[PDB]
């Protein structure tokens, strides 16, 4: 769909009023199927490894998140449609320049292709960027065709701060999701009993990311 109208008339006000935005049928059935095929090709060839945490301590990572992930730049062979999805995400964000809060977005992480392989695996309640590592917007694309949440679970439950209700996001096929990465949106991935795929990106605020890099580079 046209990036300008979607960004300015839907995504921007949605994020500024709620901090969460859902865009269903983002790319269409075809492109979604190609992205799913590429993700399953990554899975089949053993590209996924245990999802990690910002701060590792005595606990095993699988007690916190049960997904296995890999990182995609978008230009790798066999990942072309993932690159197209990433470029679409970037196009929307660029069309949101200077309208999402006070943030000045100039970059993002690579794409995290994540798989919860059923068996009740999930992600405990957590905040994506609690201590200001520069991430200001979390963007997720779901590509699970035939997903039935009432049986397979895997719902992303977000507890937006100050709201009388929480937001349940089913990992529906072709769904795109935006939400503030900071403490305003704690969230959990409820247990999944089927193979659940997602592709996540974290967009950086320029100043906060600069400060975070300064802190990291100085010890």
């Amino acid at each position: 769909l046209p990036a300008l109208k979607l960004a300015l008339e839907y995504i921007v006000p949605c994020m500024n009023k709620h901090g969460i935005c859902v865009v269903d049928d983002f790319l269409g059935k075809e492109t979604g199927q190609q992205i799913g095929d590429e993700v399953r090709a990554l899975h089949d060839t053993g590209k996924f490894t245990d999802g990690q945490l910002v701060s590792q301590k005595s606990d095993s990572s699988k007690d916190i998140r049960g997904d296995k992930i890999t990182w995609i730049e978008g230009k790798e062979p066999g990942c072309e449609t993932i690159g197209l999805l990433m470029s679409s995400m970037d196009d929307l964000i660029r069309h949101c320049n200077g309208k999402l809060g006070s943030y000045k977005i100039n970059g993002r992480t690579k794409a995290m292709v994540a798989c919860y392989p059923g068996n009740g695996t999930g992600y405990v309640r957590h905040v994506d960027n609690p201590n200001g590592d520069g991430r200001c917007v979390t963007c997720i694309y779901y590509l699970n065709k035939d997903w039935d949440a009432k049986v397979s679970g895997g719902i992303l439950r977000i507890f937006p701060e100050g709201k009388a209700q929480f937001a349940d996001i089913e990992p529906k096929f072709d769904r795109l999701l935006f939400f503030w990465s900071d403490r305003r949106n704690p969230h959990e991935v409820q247990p999944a009993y089927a193979t659940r795929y997602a592709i996540s990106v974290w967009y950086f605020d320029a100043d906060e990311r600069a400060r975070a890099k300064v802190k990291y580079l100085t010890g």
Binding site: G51, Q52, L53, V54, S55, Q56, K57, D59, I64, R65, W71, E73, D90, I93, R94, I105, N106, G107, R108, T109, K110, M112, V124, R125, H126, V127, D128, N129, P130, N131, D133, R135, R183, S200, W202, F204, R209, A212, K213, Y216, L217
Partner: peptide, 19 residues
Amino acid sequence: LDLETLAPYIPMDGEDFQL
């Protein structure tokens, strides 16, 4: 307690993708 023990890891030093 320390919420960073539960936050998803992203590369810190690295490069980052510039838009």
